[model samples]
Target: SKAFDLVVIGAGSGGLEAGWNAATLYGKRVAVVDVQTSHGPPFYAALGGTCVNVGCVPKKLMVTGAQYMDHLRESAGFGWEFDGSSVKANWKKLIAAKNEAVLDINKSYEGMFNDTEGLDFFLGWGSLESKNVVVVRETADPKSAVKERLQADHILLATGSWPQMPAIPGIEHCISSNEAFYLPEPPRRVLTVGGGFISVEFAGIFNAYKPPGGKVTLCYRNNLILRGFDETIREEVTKQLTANGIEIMTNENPAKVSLNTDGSKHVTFESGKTLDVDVVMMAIGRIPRTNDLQLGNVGVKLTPKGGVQVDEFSRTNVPNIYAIGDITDRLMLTPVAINEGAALVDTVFGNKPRKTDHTRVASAVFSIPPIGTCGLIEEVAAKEFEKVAVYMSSFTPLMHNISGSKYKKFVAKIVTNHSDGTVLGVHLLGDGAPEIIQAVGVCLRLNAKISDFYNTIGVHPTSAEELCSMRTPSYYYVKGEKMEKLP
Candidate 1:
């Protein structure tokens, strides 16, 4: 048994950052408990949480790999290709690279924990024993099992989250992002079941990387993908997805997934249509992973959606206990979690009383065309403000002029307050849109007006230049009602 100033239950970005800040910056004794995937599939175990191991980093690596395949096809339009049709990718090797990268990251986390002054990382599963105490099972093996009780002045629950799948009859046949990251070989055809960012991004990767006769089908029960995103981005991404040869099945609910003896799958829809595919991925959603943490035993509150319940400062019902990141379900994005963790440390230890602004956070989806958005959408901005002006532009980018790819169009929109011309939001769908939106996010943070954007000189002959060049409103909205467009 040991005692510490702060005990963190999870070692994801949020938990790790919280531990670091508490120990390094505040000089508090901190212990971080994390359960790496000791056994599962290839993509299962790692020190870093979803973002580093299976979620963001690996997906981006795969996406970048897929984009290179696009380059081979696009090089023809640039007049430098011999045979784009003959391009091939080694999935095994690509996965190896991704795994290697994740390993490096895990080592980095280990190094940080070891090198820190008053921080300790326990490679084990942690659960609540009491209000201010934690019980850690350090090993599953009977021979090596060691149970430790850690008492802390304050406890932070950062267990993060896990992917979820429907409980259909043949759900066991389906795999999630956890296993999708390390598929032994690329499938000839795959069905992605979900409308979320995971489904879209994976569909994009499979469609781009797979060779001839391969298929990537995105099946979603919803009418549109990215349900919470802007309507325009949803519509445009769908069009681009279809244009890129990714078959989209919308409004058709998945009834069941049947596995064949030959390692193929048969997906049956509620509409009675069926398709035989090589693989089925279930990315429906992720649930907060606090069920086994014994929250009920210690009086920690949880939301109906299964996330840890917290106030503005991330404090739980128990005064000495706190929660942040995916476990809290505020914003599942990594940076948001990190911000919450830092803010929590500052508020508790630094006496800073900092609060994370969940409203103005930026997010990006790494689909084929990609999407980046910050602030409210048209529907939301109109509801919040007296009048909202939406300046939107959809056109072919300069690279597409040379790439000649089937999916070449890009869209950008700026939502501003009509009263004072304050920039309310920015949304973009295209190559480098995320980069542009990231830069503009600072302006939005400052509550910059449209005049500020207009005053800045344009980056000539670029996609970003369009942001500053938008003049007349494509449309207007007041109190969520459409208004006449400006000429």
Candidate 2:
């Protein structure tokens, strides 16, 4: 066995970044391995992970395409005669483009590794022969069965996460986001369950498609889609969900689902109401796919959710190993994964220290109106702050001033030490949320005062400015104290 410095599994964004950093910066021997689907069409041949396959990239592209509907619908309000019937999309063509893009990305990852001096590449399943050793079984199935044993000083498990489906009796009858992307054709009737990012985003995508007579219904266990988003944003997003012709069933849970012989799915809710659909999608959540890797062999510990446990420095329980990206269950955003992978490399090679922060992380949800939020939400702030003043407003956005988009809302609350007024959370849910909230994230993370948000001049003609110009505290509560009525 060739003893090297690092072995990164799952050549996805995190794995590649970690390996490249170790080799180029630290001058350590590194290796990268992943499972590339060889059975898919040429367009998807050896493509990258879900981010490219049916996750972020594909979802965003579809969101961009859906934006056209907004333009077409708003044109009539601007003194232009507009008909919604003409606005349509070719999903098949869009899917082809998405597949091609993912394929190219895989090629790019391969190319980068090909040029690396100290990095080894294996194009098969790399099994953990032991904690420190992995045996790559040749998939070629040649006359002679051969296996390669390799060992590294550090092993970073970045196998990433996959869609999680609820084990309902008829779960097989429903598909997940992974399947939603590759559906042969869009169905006339669709039932989407869950209220997370994937649920809200896919609801938007299906609404945008608006087939000849397509209909979409979003069912969630909670009243809100993005549960932890700002109240104002939550209300506003819900309004947009309605505007998009999406029937959102709030505070509802699925009792059972049975597929009809005709191939349609009948979803029965705890409320005794039943909804029938041509397609049913469960975007409940995703869990790390590390069970098959057998981490116990290497003495690597896992979180309650099955993610490999790691420190801020991406160090695993084993002193010589590390984990990054979604597998760590820290921050699952693509940029976060890439950033962590790069930082992990720098820490190992450049003698710089990098730690992942759970606080002040900015994220986005591309539901119809699109949500981009960072920092703390009120619920989270309640846990950390003593005196918290909640300020939030739900109203049509200024863009509706001309566009008549109608749906406008957001919640911008500030939690302070109560002694120093250090803003703890900045959450938003409406259009251009991330753009506005992210600006505050920089200041918030740096210990910006709540007064800073009040003093800053809001960018004109934007929905984000609302957070800056709130007239008063829409609501207020002290830590561990009850709310008082407004006079």
Candidate 3:
């Protein structure tokens, strides 16, 4: 039996961060564990996680590869370009690099755990044996079979989520985002079902990488994609998406999923609409993966949707047990997980001063054209704020000039106290949305005002500069009815 002061389950984003903080910052012995297959994205891994391995980084590689199609579109704009010399991208090369990079990240994570004096890691599934004990279940080697009984005072349940497949007839024949990454080969006709971030981004990626006579289609239940964005942005993104030759099917629900005789996918919606594609990906979303933790026996509470409940400080109802990341249901971003994990330790040991702040956190969506949203979007703010100002803009990005794909949109909303103009929300939907929205989020989270954006000098020709051009407020709501309110 092994014992430790703090034990982190899952070597993903939050688990690694929590372990690091406990061992190095709090001076506590810590142990981390995972199944140890790490060839994926590395976006927010204090050591790295799925975003850097399988999600964002790999997605970007695919996106950039697909964007080369635009180079062909605007070849004439540049003086010395396009003499019938096409820029061809190789998917096999991209996959080779992505896999190697993922393996490298797994190695780095192992190295960190091995080298840290106070930290240890086991590669396996971890579960709660009780409040103070977390048992590691390793099937392979008997020497690796370690049972931990400790004061563990802190059991960070950072075990994340898995891509969820809805229970529709024949749904099992389809694949989730995880399996889609391991496609034996790119399907000629790939159709994705769902309206959220995962579906949009995957559609954009595959559409951007149109093979010879290949097509990508995005089908959603709503008539629109990205249902929660600003109305103008929602429309603009949808229009641009269709313009890109990526089929956007809305108001369609998949009633039956069929595995065609040729091993392709056939999606049938309730409206009798059918889509036949080589791959039909359902990116509805992910669910907290805690069923195996035996959460019921310990009486740890879970969200209505099955996510764990953790205090802002990352503790459970039972003080000795804590949760973070997808399991916590606080914020799902990889970086957010790492931050909360470290902050929980800071609260516990680093002078009890540091704590996680959930309000007004910024997030980016990697959907088509990409979107960065912070604070409240107008649709959401209407329910919360008494007064608001919706500032928005739409323009082609710099890259679009050379690509001939001329559509980009953004929204900057200031949800406020009518008397004070206290800015409550800052949102944007367009290219580099996250990059611009992150700065604005800091201000909104700090209780900035509408005058701050007005007083700031506007940068020229940048998509973010439109934020400074709101001299005249054009839209308003007096008890939810649209009105013209001059700034």
Candidate 4:
């Protein structure tokens, strides 16, 4: 039996952050229990969770690789006279290097635990045995067939989530994003079933590589991708994908999948559409992984979707038991989890009470052109405010001169309150949108208004400059409906 001040379950982004902060900042004893094989994307029989291992870092690596291919394809416009088509990527080499890099990160995480004064980690699955008790077992490969019990003053639940796969015939033949990363080879023809960011991002990566005779098809039950995003951004991203030669099939309900005799996948939809492809991926959504955590034994309540029910401070019904990250069903973004982890530490051990703020947290979709949005969407802003002003711009960027992407255009939008000029939303679609939104997010978080943006001087000749320079409204809206031009 072991005793500690704080015991964190699931050593993903949130868990690790909480442990580190408690140990380093407040000098508290922290023990983290993490299992490598059982969880979803972030679990790799290693540490650092989803963003560091499979989701954010690996996806960005592949995105950059695909962009490198685009650079070769468009290099001729820069007058580098050479046959760019001769360039080819070795999938085996790329994947091998990425795997090694991920392992290095895992080692670093272990080193931090070893070096920290009051922190320790066990590589195993953890479940609540009682109100203040936890049991950790090496279920993946038990070394001694022995279970360790830890009594803690505080317990954190951060098991995270796994990709959702519907139950249908022949579903075993399909793979989720977890398996997509470790495929033996680059797929020639891929069919992605979902309209969320996961599906679209993968589609962009495959299309950008320009594989020989390769096709990427997106099948979505909804009429468009990115269900909760701004309508203009959703439409623009769709256009960008179509321009890049990816197929978009909407109003599609995938009914079943069948394994063909020729090592292909035959997917059937509710609309009687059939697609025969080399690979099929399901990226509809993710659900909380709390079935094994034994919430019932500890009296922790769960929501309808299986997420641990948590208050604004990441606390459950039990005062000693708390939850964070995806398990809490909050924002479900990596940064949001990290923030909650830090805040929860202060509330528990640091003698300070703080609540995780969910407002104006910026987000992005890593598609071909990409999208970045902060604050409220136009539709939501109109109903929330008495009057709304919309400022928008769309044009071909100067980079197109060298890349010959004449058909590609960047868009920027700024929404403000008509009475007070308070900035309500900022949305951008094109290259570097993610980076731009982060800077704007700071202002939005501070409750900056449109006059603040107008008074500030923007660096010359840049995509972000458009946000500060715009003086006119593309349209005005009241109660979510477009009205005449603003006075």
Off by over 4 Å in 3: 40-48, 83-85, 139-151, 397-403, 409-418
Superposition TM-score, candidate 4 onto the true structure:
0.95
Please give each candidate's TM-score: 0.96, 0.90, 0.91, 0.95
Residue 102 of candidate 4: its Cα lDDT? 76
What digit string (tens of lDDT, one per residue) describes model 1 on residues 1-487? 9999999988887988899999989999999887783223642645777788778988999999888877787887777948556667888888888888888888888888779999998877788879888888855332345577899999999878888888787889889988888678888899999999999999998887675699999999978889988899899899988988899999987788887889799888999999999889998998898876888778998888889999999999898999999999778999999999999999999967998999867889998889999988989888888789998899887688788874668898889899999888889998887787887778887888877887789988888888888877888997778878532
Error of 1 at 190 (Å): 0.3
Clashes of each: 1, 5, 9, 1
- Model 2: residues with Cα > 4 Å off, grouped in runs: 1-3, 37-48, 82-84, 138-147, 410-418, 470-472, 482-487
Per-residue CA lDDT of candidate 4, range 1-487, in tens? 9899999998888988999999999999999987773323444534787777778878877877767766775687887777667777776666777777777788888888889999988867788888988888756332335477989999999888878899988889898888877777888899888999889988987776536888989989989889978888888888878978889999997889998899999999989989998888899998887876878887899998789999999999998999999898768888989999999999998778988889888999888788898988888899988789988898888877668876567889888887788898999998889999998889987788887887889988788888888877788897667887654
- Lowest lDDT 10-mer window, candidate 1? 37-46
Give the lDDT ranking, best first: 1, 4, 2, 3
Over 29-117, each residue of candidate 3 has an lDDT whose tens digit, in order, gives 88886655566332122235566556666676676666555556666665545446555556667667766766686677778877898
Model 2 is weakest, by summed lDDT over 10 consecutive residues, at: 38-47
lDDT of 3: 0.72
What TM-score, to 2 decimals, does candidate 3 have? Answer: 0.91
lDDT of 2 by residue, 1-487 (tens): 5677787777776777778778887788987776564213322213255576667877888888777778777777788885656656777777777667666766777677778889877766565667678666654232223356678766777777877888777888898887777777776789888988888888878877757878999988987776767666777678778977889999887778897989898888889899889988998888887765667666788888788888888888787777888888767787788888888878776766876566687788877677777677666666666656666655665557677776544444455444566776666666666566667768866787767777889878766676667545545546656364322
Rank the models by TM-score, top first. Answer: 1, 4, 3, 2
Once superposed on the true structure, which residue ranges of model 4 sit more than 4 Å away at CA? 37-45, 140-146
How many clashing residue pairs are found in candidate 4? 1
